[PDB]
Amino acid sequence: NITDMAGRSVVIPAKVERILLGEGRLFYAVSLLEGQKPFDRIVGWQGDFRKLDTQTYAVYKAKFPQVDNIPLIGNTTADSISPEKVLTLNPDIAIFGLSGHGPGKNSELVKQLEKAGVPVVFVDFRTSPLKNTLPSMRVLGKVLHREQQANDYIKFYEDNVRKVTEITSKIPADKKPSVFIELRAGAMEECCGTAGKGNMGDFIDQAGGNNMAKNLLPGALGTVNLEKVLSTNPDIYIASGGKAPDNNAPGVSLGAQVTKEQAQSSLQTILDRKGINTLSAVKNGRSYGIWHNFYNSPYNVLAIQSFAKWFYPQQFADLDPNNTMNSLYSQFLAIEPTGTYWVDST
Amino acid sequence: NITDMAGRSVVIPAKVERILLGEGRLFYAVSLLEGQKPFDRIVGWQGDFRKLDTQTYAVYKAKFPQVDNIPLIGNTTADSISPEKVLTLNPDIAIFGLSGHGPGKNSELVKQLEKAGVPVVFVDFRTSPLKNTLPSMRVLGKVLHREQQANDYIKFYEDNVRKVTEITSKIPADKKPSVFIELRAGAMEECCGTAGKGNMGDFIDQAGGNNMAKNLLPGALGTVNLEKVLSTNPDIYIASGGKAPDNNAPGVSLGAQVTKEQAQSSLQTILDRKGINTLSAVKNGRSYGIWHNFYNSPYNVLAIQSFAKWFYPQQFADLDPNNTMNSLYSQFLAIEPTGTYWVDST
Amino acid sequence: NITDMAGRSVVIPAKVERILLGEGRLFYAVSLLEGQKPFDRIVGWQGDFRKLDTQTYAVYKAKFPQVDNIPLIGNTTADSISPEKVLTLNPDIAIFGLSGHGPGKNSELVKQLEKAGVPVVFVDFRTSPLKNTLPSMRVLGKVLHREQQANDYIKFYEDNVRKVTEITSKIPADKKPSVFIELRAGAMEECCGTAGKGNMGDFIDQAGGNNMAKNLLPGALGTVNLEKVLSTNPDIYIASGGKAPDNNAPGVSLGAQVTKEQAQSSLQTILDRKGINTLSAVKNGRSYGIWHNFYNSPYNVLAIQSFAKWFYPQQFADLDPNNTMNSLYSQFLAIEPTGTYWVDST
Ligand SMILES: N=C(N)NCCC[C@H](NC(=O)c1cccc(O)c1O)C(=O)N[C@@H](CO)C(=O)O
Ligand SMILES: N=C(N)NCCC[C@H](NC(=O)c1cccc(O)c1O)C(=O)N[C@@H](CO)C(=O)O
Ligand SMILES: N=C(N)NCCC[C@H](NC(=O)c1cccc(O)c1O)C(=O)N[C@@H](CO)C(=O)O
Ligand SMILES: N=C(N)NCCC[C@H](NC(=O)c1cccc(O)c1O)C(=O)N[C@@H](CO)C(=O)O
Ligand SMILES: N=C(N)NCCC[C@H](NC(=O)c1cccc(O)c1O)C(=O)N[C@@H](CO)C(=O)O
Ligand SMILES: N=C(N)NCCC[C@H](NC(=O)c1cccc(O)c1O)C(=O)N[C@@H](CO)C(=O)O
Ligand SMILES: [Fe+3]
Ligand SMILES: [Fe+3]
């Protein structure tokens, strides 16, 4: 028996071969456990990975065309999941997130699955990454019978994060830069999405930054108005995005199929927006892009390192997140690293 | 045949295997006797431990999931206890508290149990901790056939308290700091709950402090108005709480699943309240948090030591309650110590 | 899963909670991994730490009185270990030394444990400190699930040794001082115990000294006669001891409860002995004391540094092994550094 991220006790199956993914991008945690057979045990998933991660999807499709045949239990919202299609896949485990584009701990689907005798496991990389990322992997390890892969990934993660925290944990508040992170910058109806005490806010905290929205918001995610950002005028501006290169919608292009040029050009569009473009951080060139999906992925150690290099460039001169990324892929994954997951403004 | 804390003679069962807990948090006294098999002999308990100690509960659940199946004889009040459900558990002993969220010496349930041939034992950690804590453990030892564990715990307790009283018993009244303790600070409808001649007041007395409410109240618990506190303007302010980290209700977060940062941030909210924030003690930083449930637990030596170290920081520089706790857990308990049971203001 | 110091493969246990120490002073390696909970996972140990390290023992007892209740599997010799008492502690791992006052790789007890399904790990700080100290810590890290602590300690050790080797690695052999180390000087029946190509000899080598016994002895430990020492007449004389202050037996007083004046007075007795007192090194004041138990401890970087400062006083005038010890204690241990681990003759 194990305790999940919702505090609930789950009886670990003896053998698992039919994993249901409540949120598609929970695949990222699964991918670190499944080695060269990533999709072998996935009976179905939320459509967020396929529809909101088109780049990483296409790369896996070229090497594994059977990914197109994994059933989509819904689109990009918990309310679009048919509980009927879910139950006919006869899952032997369901992995859900405390928050996100999939069902939460109190949804009806979770209760249906409990009535059907299906174990449900709650993880979290999104609400409280700092508290939950490593415990989530430990748990996934136990319930999916990949304790070795999980323990290997925890050691890798802790080591690569400790490279940052051993420095930034001793830095006093008055030496820290103020930071604003604009999630899916340019791409929301109303500006500006950001993170509070949670989500990418945890990364700012760890990397020794001072999140200007920490005390503006009650939750992990929320909204702050453009004028409030301008008025606080923070040291460092960061925009998140995951837009595909050939997508004429607004936002920052980052991901497996994005070149540095495309990333630099599309970040610049984001930085050229009225108001944003007068920020001290933008004018001083302390303006950056981070790949959005790190907001819900145990690969988030890559962002924590990118933030640290941006927050204290010389103290982390020697640290290279591309090498962390390469090590991650070679040790754990079944595809080759490509594209641009972070960018600095020209 | 032995004398309980209500002065009543009780017959020690030849063998006990079905313990009824009048107040759930009386478990704390039982836990010191049951070693690695904490829940083996509990037939049922008041729901206060499960509902008002969610953190310590969850930790025991992760290691012992059978705790969820122990029957709840009521919620959090003596009046919600069904005497019928109690009697069908066929207890062979019932442990009750002279005061608290469970039946007292004159309740009907106590009389019913006497008619049913069931021995009832009264303990006390709440009304008169100083008089009653050690005698209570001695008695529980005898009636539960754990005399060794009890005598071991008494020696540990006396030794760890003597570390304080050796010093504070010789301090004259006029050199003692004035102290106000605000129980469940921030979390009551009407401010401010506190302790008089009894409860945490006994801890203030032992730790060489001067409880400003000692003479304002007739009983162990009561209420003093905010303005009375402001006017007395005591040297030292202490707030008690046991709020879970992820609980948006008002109060201080302390317990097994609370990090120091969380305790400090939530203590600060408590200290930022109108009136409280102008106290000399708050401005001077002599402001502290203590875990509420020490108000009814033989682990109360941890608070006594935390009080003495706040009352005389250099005389108790060398005393460390986190070790006293770690020694307590390793010697007596079946879980690992985690979280924050005491905090100092930043 | 891992290769120990005897070349044997040991399967890393999933969880360890019952560590058996073949030699008590192997605790020193464990202490670097267990943080503030040093004795939490020790089921039992050889009595050498308690009986041959009375000072370090007493310091840990004053903070942790539960250390007295850890079972002693024997006295100070492998032949006094009851294999029966060992097996009834149901260890889940046993840590043994290639050499010392506990069982070796060919003992019966090692075979018994293999029959019982208990993993055995061989470490070494004693025979071949230079080859084995860091590999031993790496291994202990993996099998005890304290990889972080281990990697932290290795980095600390390598850095603090590099402070010496950066200088002594470029000194040519003909400029190096001849050195004799007399182990447990004054305290043996027959003079003079010393180290050959191993044990404290490795420290002499690293610190840029020339061990006069290197080629007189086949093993790590052995004996050279007084007259051979007198005839070689080495540049530098070093005596090891660990005698308690209030012990009027012969030997050097060094350890956690020893003052510099007691270490100087007792070293002087050792240097006033017939034969020894005519050494050029003694007359010239190049005579020193080192704490014996460094002969089997990963804290041995303190002796390497103390030796280099004795071998090349001005080249290492800026090096302070006391600051190193303090960085060691504060970073890794649960007690406060006290006493005298090294002394110079007046
Ligand atoms: N397409 C929708 N209508 N909703 C998306 C579902 C989840 C929702 N997401 C966000 O608020 C969000 C904010 C910034 C950046 C992102 O990538 C986001 O997905 C959400 O978070 N809902 C909360 C509240 O219900 C939750 O799930 O607890
Ligand atoms: N809670 C909401 N109603 N909207 C915020 C989230 C929903 C939607 N999200 C995305 O399009 C998205 C894309 C990639 C990765 C993600 O995690 C995403 O959430 C969204 O942003 N809607 C915008 C309008 O498009 C909005 O609602 O402001
Ligand atoms: N929800 C209720 N009505 N009562 C709760 C339990 C009984 C009551 N408790 C307290 O007054 C109390 C006060 C401060 C802090 C605490 O943690 C408390 O539990 C109570 O004690 N009643 C008294 C008077 O009869 C008693 O039982 O002796
Ligand atoms: N005698 C009373 N009427 N109130 C005092 C106790 C009743 C209640 N207590 C708790 O919720 C509680 C929680 C954790 C631990 C405890 O020991 C508790 O007693 C209480 O405080 N009610 C509040 C309103 O919430 C109040 O009295 O204002
Ligand atoms: N107490 C005993 N009678 N024997 C102890 C056995 C270990 C023995 N140790 C030493 O010879 C020694 C020499 C100098 C200084 C020390 O602190 C020592 O402990 C020993 O090493 N024996 C050999 C051969 O059996 C070995 O263990 O390899
Ligand atoms: N192999 C042997 N027979 N003797 C050498 C070691 C045995 C004994 N050891 C100790 O007293 C001792 C004390 C502290 C730390 C250690 O590592 C120790 O070994 C010893 O030295 N006996 C002497 C008699 O005085 C001797 O053999 O000369
Ligand atoms: Fe999203
Ligand atoms: Fe209460």
PDB file of C-alpha atoms in Angstrom, chain A residues 124-265:
ATOM      1  CA  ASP A 124       1.294  16.529  -8.607  1.00  0.00           C
ATOM      2  CA  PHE A 125       3.861  18.512 -10.623  1.00  0.00           C
ATOM      3  CA  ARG A 126       1.653  21.576 -11.007  1.00  0.00           C
ATOM      4  CA  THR A 127       0.172  22.871  -7.777  1.00  0.00           C
ATOM      5  CA  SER A 128       3.155  22.234  -5.486  1.00  0.00           C
ATOM      6  CA  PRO A 129       6.127  21.066  -7.595  1.00  0.00           C
ATOM      7  CA  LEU A 130       8.592  21.618  -4.739  1.00  0.00           C
ATOM      8  CA  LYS A 131       6.649  19.482  -2.235  1.00  0.00           C
ATOM      9  CA  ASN A 132       5.239  16.967  -4.701  1.00  0.00           C
ATOM     10  CA  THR A 133       7.523  16.273  -7.711  1.00  0.00           C
ATOM     11  CA  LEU A 134       9.841  13.753  -6.034  1.00  0.00           C
ATOM     12  CA  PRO A 135       7.170  12.076  -3.828  1.00  0.00           C
ATOM     13  CA  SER A 136       5.059  11.734  -7.012  1.00  0.00           C
ATOM     14  CA  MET A 137       7.849   9.858  -8.827  1.00  0.00           C
ATOM     15  CA  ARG A 138       8.489   7.650  -5.766  1.00  0.00           C
ATOM     16  CA  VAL A 139       4.807   6.729  -5.740  1.00  0.00           C
ATOM     17  CA  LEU A 140       4.576   6.158  -9.514  1.00  0.00           C
ATOM     18  CA  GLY A 141       7.599   3.902  -9.172  1.00  0.00           C
ATOM     19  CA  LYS A 142       5.832   1.708  -6.599  1.00  0.00           C
ATOM     20  CA  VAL A 143       2.444   1.411  -8.303  1.00  0.00           C
ATOM     21  CA  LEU A 144       3.867   0.864 -11.822  1.00  0.00           C
ATOM     22  CA  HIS A 145       6.659  -1.519 -10.671  1.00  0.00           C
ATOM     23  CA  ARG A 146       9.502   0.714 -11.852  1.00  0.00           C
ATOM     24  CA  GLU A 147      11.088   1.488  -8.482  1.00  0.00           C
ATOM     25  CA  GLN A 148      14.577   1.309 -10.016  1.00  0.00           C
ATOM     26  CA  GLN A 149      13.839   3.846 -12.773  1.00  0.00           C
ATOM     27  CA  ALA A 150      12.083   6.121 -10.277  1.00  0.00           C
ATOM     28  CA  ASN A 151      14.928   5.993  -7.740  1.00  0.00           C
ATOM     29  CA  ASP A 152      17.420   6.606 -10.561  1.00  0.00           C
ATOM     30  CA  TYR A 153      15.446   9.692 -11.652  1.00  0.00           C
ATOM     31  CA  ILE A 154      15.119  11.052  -8.108  1.00  0.00           C
ATOM     32  CA  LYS A 155      18.886  10.795  -7.614  1.00  0.00           C
ATOM     33  CA  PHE A 156      19.460  12.565 -10.974  1.00  0.00           C
ATOM     34  CA  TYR A 157      16.912  15.254 -10.105  1.00  0.00           C
ATOM     35  CA  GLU A 158      18.120  15.918  -6.555  1.00  0.00           C
ATOM     36  CA  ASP A 159      21.740  16.147  -7.739  1.00  0.00           C
ATOM     37  CA  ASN A 160      20.934  18.583 -10.543  1.00  0.00           C
ATOM     38  CA  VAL A 161      18.658  20.723  -8.373  1.00  0.00           C
ATOM     39  CA  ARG A 162      21.152  20.666  -5.469  1.00  0.00           C
ATOM     40  CA  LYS A 163      23.638  22.326  -7.852  1.00  0.00           C
ATOM     41  CA  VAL A 164      21.288  25.329  -7.644  1.00  0.00           C
ATOM     42  CA  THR A 165      19.859  25.139  -4.115  1.00  0.00           C
ATOM     43  CA  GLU A 166      23.225  24.667  -2.366  1.00  0.00           C
ATOM     44  CA  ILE A 167      23.947  28.232  -3.599  1.00  0.00           C
ATOM     45  CA  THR A 168      20.526  29.977  -3.608  1.00  0.00           C
ATOM     46  CA  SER A 169      19.327  28.594  -0.241  1.00  0.00           C
ATOM     47  CA  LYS A 170      21.959  30.768   1.515  1.00  0.00           C
ATOM     48  CA  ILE A 171      21.215  33.984  -0.462  1.00  0.00           C
ATOM     49  CA  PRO A 172      19.410  36.667   1.638  1.00  0.00           C
ATOM     50  CA  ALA A 173      16.136  38.167   0.405  1.00  0.00           C
ATOM     51  CA  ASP A 174      17.589  41.647  -0.187  1.00  0.00           C
ATOM     52  CA  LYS A 175      20.118  40.297  -2.722  1.00  0.00           C
ATOM     53  CA  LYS A 176      17.443  38.435  -4.731  1.00  0.00           C
ATOM     54  CA  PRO A 177      16.065  39.785  -8.052  1.00  0.00           C
ATOM     55  CA  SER A 178      12.348  40.487  -8.387  1.00  0.00           C
ATOM     56  CA  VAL A 179      10.766  38.254 -11.057  1.00  0.00           C
ATOM     57  CA  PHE A 180       7.508  38.122 -12.969  1.00  0.00           C
ATOM     58  CA  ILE A 181       6.568  35.014 -14.947  1.00  0.00           C
ATOM     59  CA  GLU A 182       3.912  35.473 -17.607  1.00  0.00           C
ATOM     60  CA  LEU A 183       2.414  32.036 -18.359  1.00  0.00           C
ATOM     61  CA  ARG A 184       1.342  31.460 -21.961  1.00  0.00           C
ATOM     62  CA  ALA A 185       2.282  35.082 -22.510  1.00  0.00           C
ATOM     63  CA  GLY A 186       0.509  36.769 -25.425  1.00  0.00           C
ATOM     64  CA  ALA A 187      -1.801  33.751 -25.784  1.00  0.00           C
ATOM     65  CA  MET A 188      -4.489  34.377 -23.136  1.00  0.00           C
ATOM     66  CA  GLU A 189      -7.630  36.481 -23.714  1.00  0.00           C
ATOM     67  CA  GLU A 190      -6.838  38.657 -20.678  1.00  0.00           C
ATOM     68  CA  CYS A 191      -3.260  39.453 -19.632  1.00  0.00           C
ATOM     69  CA  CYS A 192      -1.463  38.364 -17.548  1.00  0.00           C
ATOM     70  CA  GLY A 193      -1.450  34.750 -16.314  1.00  0.00           C
ATOM     71  CA  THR A 194       1.185  33.904 -13.711  1.00  0.00           C
ATOM     72  CA  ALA A 195       2.040  31.729 -10.761  1.00  0.00           C
ATOM     73  CA  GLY A 196       1.678  32.496  -7.058  1.00  0.00           C
ATOM     74  CA  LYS A 197       2.858  30.320  -4.168  1.00  0.00           C
ATOM     75  CA  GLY A 198       3.071  27.232  -6.412  1.00  0.00           C
ATOM     76  CA  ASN A 199       3.600  26.108 -10.010  1.00  0.00           C
ATOM     77  CA  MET A 200       6.534  27.905 -11.669  1.00  0.00           C
ATOM     78  CA  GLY A 201       6.591  30.097  -8.562  1.00  0.00           C
ATOM     79  CA  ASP A 202       8.239  27.167  -6.806  1.00  0.00           C
ATOM     80  CA  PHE A 203      10.986  27.307  -9.450  1.00  0.00           C
ATOM     81  CA  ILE A 204      11.545  31.012  -8.909  1.00  0.00           C
ATOM     82  CA  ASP A 205      11.766  30.348  -5.150  1.00  0.00           C
ATOM     83  CA  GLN A 206      14.273  27.496  -5.568  1.00  0.00           C
ATOM     84  CA  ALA A 207      16.398  29.418  -8.097  1.00  0.00           C
ATOM     85  CA  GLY A 208      16.729  32.208  -5.493  1.00  0.00           C
ATOM     86  CA  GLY A 209      14.354  34.648  -7.194  1.00  0.00           C
ATOM     87  CA  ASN A 210      11.607  36.804  -5.700  1.00  0.00           C
ATOM     88  CA  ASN A 211       8.252  36.164  -7.355  1.00  0.00           C
ATOM     89  CA  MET A 212       6.357  39.460  -7.512  1.00  0.00           C
ATOM     90  CA  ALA A 213       3.037  37.542  -7.654  1.00  0.00           C
ATOM     91  CA  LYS A 214       3.762  35.352  -4.600  1.00  0.00           C
ATOM     92  CA  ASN A 215       1.600  37.648  -2.418  1.00  0.00           C
ATOM     93  CA  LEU A 216      -0.770  38.952  -5.119  1.00  0.00           C
ATOM     94  CA  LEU A 217      -2.462  35.542  -5.485  1.00  0.00           C
ATOM     95  CA  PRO A 218      -4.047  32.992  -3.113  1.00  0.00           C
ATOM     96  CA  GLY A 219      -3.480  29.962  -5.363  1.00  0.00           C
ATOM     97  CA  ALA A 220      -0.778  28.361  -7.501  1.00  0.00           C
ATOM     98  CA  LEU A 221      -2.193  29.972 -10.648  1.00  0.00           C
ATOM     99  CA  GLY A 222      -4.008  33.244 -11.236  1.00  0.00           C
ATOM    100  CA  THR A 223      -3.979  36.580 -13.069  1.00  0.00           C
ATOM    101  CA  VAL A 224      -2.298  39.955 -12.439  1.00  0.00           C
ATOM    102  CA  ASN A 225      -3.164  43.026 -14.517  1.00  0.00           C
ATOM    103  CA  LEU A 226      -0.617  44.524 -16.922  1.00  0.00           C
ATOM    104  CA  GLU A 227      -0.568  47.812 -15.017  1.00  0.00           C
ATOM    105  CA  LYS A 228       0.299  46.011 -11.775  1.00  0.00           C
ATOM    106  CA  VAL A 229       3.314  44.455 -13.503  1.00  0.00           C
ATOM    107  CA  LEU A 230       4.407  47.813 -14.961  1.00  0.00           C
ATOM    108  CA  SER A 231       4.049  49.415 -11.538  1.00  0.00           C
ATOM    109  CA  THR A 232       6.054  46.724  -9.695  1.00  0.00           C
ATOM    110  CA  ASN A 233       8.609  46.952 -12.548  1.00  0.00           C
ATOM    111  CA  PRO A 234      10.505  43.737 -11.684  1.00  0.00           C
ATOM    112  CA  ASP A 235      14.199  43.034 -12.261  1.00  0.00           C
ATOM    113  CA  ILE A 236      13.554  40.017 -14.529  1.00  0.00           C
ATOM    114  CA  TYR A 237      10.751  39.168 -16.954  1.00  0.00           C
ATOM    115  CA  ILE A 238      10.065  35.550 -18.053  1.00  0.00           C
ATOM    116  CA  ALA A 239       7.480  34.453 -20.616  1.00  0.00           C
ATOM    117  CA  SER A 240       6.288  30.852 -20.939  1.00  0.00           C
ATOM    118  CA  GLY A 241       4.976  29.317 -24.161  1.00  0.00           C
ATOM    119  CA  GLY A 242       4.849  26.054 -26.116  1.00  0.00           C
ATOM    120  CA  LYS A 243       3.585  27.248 -29.490  1.00  0.00           C
ATOM    121  CA  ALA A 244       4.457  25.241 -32.607  1.00  0.00           C
ATOM    122  CA  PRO A 245       6.621  27.125 -35.170  1.00  0.00           C
ATOM    123  CA  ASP A 246       3.988  27.022 -37.912  1.00  0.00           C
ATOM    124  CA  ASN A 247       1.116  28.242 -35.729  1.00  0.00           C
ATOM    125  CA  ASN A 248      -0.049  31.797 -36.485  1.00  0.00           C
ATOM    126  CA  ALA A 249      -1.815  32.078 -33.109  1.00  0.00           C
ATOM    127  CA  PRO A 250      -0.180  34.482 -30.586  1.00  0.00           C
ATOM    128  CA  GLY A 251       2.501  33.264 -28.161  1.00  0.00           C
ATOM    129  CA  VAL A 252       6.094  32.112 -27.711  1.00  0.00           C
ATOM    130  CA  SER A 253       7.335  29.201 -29.825  1.00  0.00           C
ATOM    131  CA  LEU A 254       9.274  26.673 -27.761  1.00  0.00           C
ATOM    132  CA  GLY A 255       9.564  22.863 -27.900  1.00  0.00           C
ATOM    133  CA  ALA A 256      11.068  19.847 -29.684  1.00  0.00           C
ATOM    134  CA  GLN A 257      10.596  21.291 -33.210  1.00  0.00           C
ATOM    135  CA  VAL A 258      11.596  24.905 -32.530  1.00  0.00           C
ATOM    136  CA  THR A 259      14.882  26.474 -33.602  1.00  0.00           C
ATOM    137  CA  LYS A 260      16.631  29.124 -31.507  1.00  0.00           C
ATOM    138  CA  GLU A 261      15.877  31.673 -34.304  1.00  0.00           C
ATOM    139  CA  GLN A 262      12.127  30.928 -34.202  1.00  0.00           C
ATOM    140  CA  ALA A 263      12.219  31.068 -30.362  1.00  0.00           C
ATOM    141  CA  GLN A 264      14.176  34.360 -30.366  1.00  0.00           C
ATOM    142  CA  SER A 265      11.920  35.916 -33.029  1.00  0.00           C
TER     143      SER A 265
END
